[PDB]
Amino acid sequence: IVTLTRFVMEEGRKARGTGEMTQLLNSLCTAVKAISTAVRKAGILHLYGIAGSTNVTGDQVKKLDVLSNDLVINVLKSSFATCVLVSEEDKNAIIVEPEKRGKYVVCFDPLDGSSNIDCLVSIGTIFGIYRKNSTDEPSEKDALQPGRNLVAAGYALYGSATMLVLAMVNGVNCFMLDPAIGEFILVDRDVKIKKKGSIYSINEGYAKEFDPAITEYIQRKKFPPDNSAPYGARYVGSMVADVHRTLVYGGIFMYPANKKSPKGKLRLLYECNPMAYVMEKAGGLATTGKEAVLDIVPTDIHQRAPIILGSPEDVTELLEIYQKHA
Amino acid sequence: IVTLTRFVMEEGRKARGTGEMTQLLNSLCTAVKAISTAVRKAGILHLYGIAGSTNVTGDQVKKLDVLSNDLVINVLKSSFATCVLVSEEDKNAIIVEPEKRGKYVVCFDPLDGSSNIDCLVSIGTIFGIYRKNSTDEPSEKDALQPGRNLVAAGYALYGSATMLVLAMVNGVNCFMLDPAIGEFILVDRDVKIKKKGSIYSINEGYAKEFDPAITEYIQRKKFPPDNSAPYGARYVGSMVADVHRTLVYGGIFMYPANKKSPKGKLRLLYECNPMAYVMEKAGGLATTGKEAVLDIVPTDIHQRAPIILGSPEDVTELLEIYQKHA
Amino acid sequence: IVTLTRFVMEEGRKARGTGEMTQLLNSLCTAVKAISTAVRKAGILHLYGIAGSTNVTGDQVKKLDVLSNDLVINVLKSSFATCVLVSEEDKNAIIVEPEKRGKYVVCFDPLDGSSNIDCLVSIGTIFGIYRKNSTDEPSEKDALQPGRNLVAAGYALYGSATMLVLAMVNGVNCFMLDPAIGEFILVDRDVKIKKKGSIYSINEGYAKEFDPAITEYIQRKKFPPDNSAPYGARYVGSMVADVHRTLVYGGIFMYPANKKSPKGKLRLLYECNPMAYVMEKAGGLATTGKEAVLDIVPTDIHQRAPIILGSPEDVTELLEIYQKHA
Amino acid sequence: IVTLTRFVMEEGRKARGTGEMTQLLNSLCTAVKAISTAVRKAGILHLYGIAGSTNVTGDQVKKLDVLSNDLVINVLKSSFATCVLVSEEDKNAIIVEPEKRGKYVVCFDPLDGSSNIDCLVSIGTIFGIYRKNSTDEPSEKDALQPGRNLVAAGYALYGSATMLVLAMVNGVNCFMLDPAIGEFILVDRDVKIKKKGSIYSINEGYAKEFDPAITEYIQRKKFPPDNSAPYGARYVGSMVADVHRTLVYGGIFMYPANKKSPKGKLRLLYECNPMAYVMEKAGGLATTGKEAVLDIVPTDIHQRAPIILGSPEDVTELLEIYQKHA
């Protein structure tokens, strides 16, 4: 029945758009379809391996990182829709050339889940979009806006299937990719997260580095005090996968500050904020433990932040702990 | 360069086979390719949902369970290669009809990872094969052989890519599926597992139900006593995915007996034993905590067992704990 | 490098469009991709057979006719771009409903080449587009415009490859479909036809029904009077295929009036005019034998016309004969 | 229901085979699937163009010629099934190396229809297979057997769909390729040709070079003397396509000797004989005009012959003319 293209246009029409938010999104889709095709046979393309470098953020860069990165930089460019790009792979903001330039700023993780490539676990692409504020010549500053300024945010999951999840002012919609005809077919319209789930998702390899609240919280999931059943544990290793499972099954996902990462691991611009926006749009929350993610005015484009998100009741139960303690 | 077909035949030729081990395997591949195609667009085929029943083992059965099941039952049948089939989905052994019958017994999880379907996490298919012993009319007994009798074992992963991993007397080989031409192209020849890794994989939602060894072991992964770095934690939720990551990255995977499941959760016939065989063939171990999995003469086809597997040094470190305690 | 999407937008941007010519075209592409996927496995979908009816024009209707028809009617509708549709399969004009209506009229052969389906020869889709003139409530009349009013025209070939050929005021571009990622990649930019070729393409099964000019002309192709080599003969059976080969190799294609079809066989609205427009835009001609096709004000939507098209020198050589005789 | 693999094995089983006729055939299929994938996007792979050479037989060699050739040479080799290969592209017989050698001789047109590549018309692959006679070290002679010695013959059509047609002692079966899962699904079981059709297929560009019988025959198709309707004319340009349409619709296909090609154009080994074998197995005929094709002991591997084939009544009507005249 409904293709992403169609849905795009019908929702962008009713909002009276110029078509520019549109070109952009459709450009992004092609990017996703291309990445997804490569991923489904990346080992047959010798795309596992290193490309040979370290990130601005520290990552040991893989070829897939590269390919998928170029693709997005390409497709966003040719869209005539954007003016500033912030990529995980790129040290500095990318300023579109003047003739190809649009009024949009786009932050993205071209391939989230690097630790999961070689072993063929789920991985994905995350992106956010803000409308340009400044009249300034477009600079790196036009990215340093908080999450509450996002006009669109989503991510693609190359899981058992390839899914494109997309949130805007009015809600979250999931579209799945039909490899056969190369289109994204709406699978879930206007998705909402459960008020409470029963899955906690965290790398407990940092049990020792964790703070007193995370510690108390986990213990409560494992030793429920109302003597209810203990939450299930899940941690795929790929932010896009865990966030998504949290989305459809409910529960909570966690990458908290620890004694070593005052500011957690995940990046504000291109992992944290879009995931938060999606999530709030579905009716769940997203906190550092101490403040909403979407309210944080970034000062650095590669800056990290902690992140608690998911079922509102769960996220709340833990905000309470953080209070109980600080 | 090398397709599964080719590799099959060249290795089956050198062993002087009848071609029967062969027909069988190739039949299995088609099964896998079909399952994989459906999975990559299962939501677009309305294959998420329930089919409407409970298993012999307890599972809330999904349509994918069904489809994928029928397919294997079909393809194994038409192969002329098998005589007894044991399926997760099927209460009783399936006895091939006499004209289509072969000298092989095939146990399989048609779709492992049901809790992970809806959220699009990795899932897969696991299978084992034994040569028929009895001259008896083929009965359910011809399945009740221990794991050290396996002639072939492997599984397919529908992860970010679709992989077909296969172990026989001589070693483990990975083949990836190229959707484009619908063939399985050898990606890794004669794979070996690291002697020690740094990932422990377990549902810690049962922290409370766990025994003293598992408990002590996890604590050691989190609080290394040689003050080394603490292992990373991973738990996809899908046996096929976690086993596989263990395979290529090293580390350990765990689904131990607990105060509620004297005998763990996973089934001996079609989850545990094939995974153990693969794993031992790669150079790692697979234990109940108390005995090798492959040495356990099953008495029931749907019987469960605990299972510790992975890097030999890790699996050993924990066997020691189990000793230290019992 | 360039996708149809991209090329669409960049050429529609420079013309200052509303995006409406655009939505429409992209809708058409999805239609084509869908038709093409089905065709590449139509026998495996039991799509060879009859659907069970006769056309307004006389055709024994096949299921593919139907499927492909519905698809276009669907996709053109949802585009918000059109107001009147004329289909080969549909007796009367189709008037889009008011809320979904646009300012465009679209005539199309949903699946050209029915005699060639069962035997797996090339087949295709042809379409034309005019901008609405009347302020009249959109009626069937808004289709009864001549070919020189076309704003866009092309067709898709499902040949050995799937090609999308598209002509507008500024020229003809070919895009090929990459099944892998489901996009149309520009293969030939701004195509031109040779001034003269060496292939004549005609159903000589009507040798007897043919007029004196066609007869004289064919004889000249077979017995060249400058004692040059005789033209090659080609006649696939599928208008889309023969027109296209004429396009890229040069030569001439013919479906002339005969003693039985005062007005030839092919339909003006949806076979003849778009093929003529493409062809003139490439630098060749298209004549009834007596008048340009694009100058013919249709009076009936299912009306036929003769059609000579291809290399300008050839088409001219034959216009001369038609003169020499009448 | 039935895959080529399955059908292969079940028919090869009942004949009590070694599996060697089998390996071979399945190797051939992969070859076909690979060629077909490339063809469906050959322009996107820059595979239109010249590779840069002339054949033993005269052809201006295209890259597709090359790719597809290598593939077959590869796959036939690795099959362990063959000992001599005769290719259109290869001047001399190819003698498999001793360790990879089998008891089979395989002649093939790796890509029939070169004049049709660039314009995206249907093209294909033709092949024949004979069992080795000599005890001689395998030489070029083991190919110089007549057509009545063929054990298997068929061809693949990359038309609107990709079809694999295959004849053996017991009859002709068509299998279509489902791109989706990369398998060949039986579409027509044990096919038969009509006793008479109404389509004559010939390059009438040689009207002038033709002999008195062909001339008289064509005139009869166009001016039926029983005043019946005149046959339809078809000539795709691609032997594989015209032969196939003849197969399923009935009628006749013609590439006769002419004043310039005492021996017609098509090659005996790899175009003519397999097409003849298929055709006779369906219940039609195949003649030079003067003698069955399958009875001709070749003396040269690249030798040509005329060829009339199709509906037995038609082929007969024309054999009579050839008599009437000589």
Ligand SMILES: Nc1ncnc2c1ncn2[C@@H]1O[C@H](COP(=O)(O)O)[C@@H](O)[C@H]1O
């Ligand atoms: N396809 C669309 N879906 C939803 N909103 C849109 C769309 N296109 C445009 N808009 C809204 O209109 C604003 C400007 O549109 P545009 O003129 O295309 O940049 C955006 O910030 C959106 O909020």
Ligand SMILES: Nc1ncnc2c1ncn2[C@@H]1O[C@H](COP(=O)(O)O)[C@@H](O)[C@H]1O
């Ligand atoms: N394709 C193969 N690869 C490895 N071993 C094989 C193969 N086919 C047969 N064998 C060996 O030969 C035994 C019997 O072969 P079969 O006669 O095909 O049942 C099996 O138990 C295998 O150990």
Ligand SMILES: Nc1ncnc2c1ncn2[C@@H]1O[C@H](COP(=O)(O)O)[C@@H](O)[C@H]1O
């Ligand atoms: N994508 C496009 N390519 C070429 N011309 C276009 C395109 N879109 C619009 N136009 C031109 O602008 C006119 C109206 O555009 P629209 O406002 O989209 O209906 C059309 O008749 C075209 O000639």
Ligand SMILES: Nc1ncnc2c1ncn2[C@@H]1O[C@H](COP(=O)(O)O)[C@@H](O)[C@H]1O
């Ligand atoms: N798959 C098959 N289908 C039909 N006949 C076969 C097949 N395999 C073998 N045969 C017959 O058995 C002969 C030798 O088989 P093989 O031992 O495989 O070379 C061939 O010449 C065939 O006529």
Ligand SMILES: O=P(O)(O)OC[C@H]1O[C@](O)(CO)[C@@H](O)[C@@H]1O
């Ligand atoms: O390896 P860790 O410490 O568990 O962190 C995993 C995280 O790393 C990422 O790959 C980004 O670094 C995320 O996708 C994922 O949540």
Ligand SMILES: O=P(O)(O)OC[C@H]1O[C@](O)(CO)[C@@H](O)[C@@H]1O
């Ligand atoms: O849901 P739990 O208790 O973590 O168990 C997960 C296990 O269940 C299975 O789906 C089989 O029941 C395995 O794939 C997986 O290891």
Ligand SMILES: O=P(O)(O)OC[C@H]1O[C@](O)(CO)[C@@H](O)[C@@H]1O
């Ligand atoms: O069957 P005929 O008389 O040769 O006409 C063939 C024509 O018919 C069509 O299928 C439309 O009727 C065209 O595609 C093709 O040119």
Ligand SMILES: O=P(O)(O)OC[C@H]1O[C@](O)(CO)[C@@H](O)[C@@H]1O
């Ligand atoms: O170009 P001509 O003379 O019509 O001959 C066409 C023949 O050439 C071939 O391409 C082989 O030369 C055949 O496929 C086809 O029948």
Ligand SMILES: [Mn+2]
């Ligand atoms: Mn990244």
Ligand SMILES: [Mn+2]
């Ligand atoms: Mn990431």
Ligand SMILES: [Mn+2]
């Ligand atoms: Mn299962």
Ligand SMILES: [Mn+2]
């Ligand atoms: Mn399972």
Ligand SMILES: [Mn+2]
């Ligand atoms: Mn039609």
Ligand SMILES: [Mn+2]
């Ligand atoms: Mn038509």
Ligand SMILES: [Mn+2]
């Ligand atoms: Mn050739």
Ligand SMILES: [Mn+2]
């Ligand atoms: Mn040929």
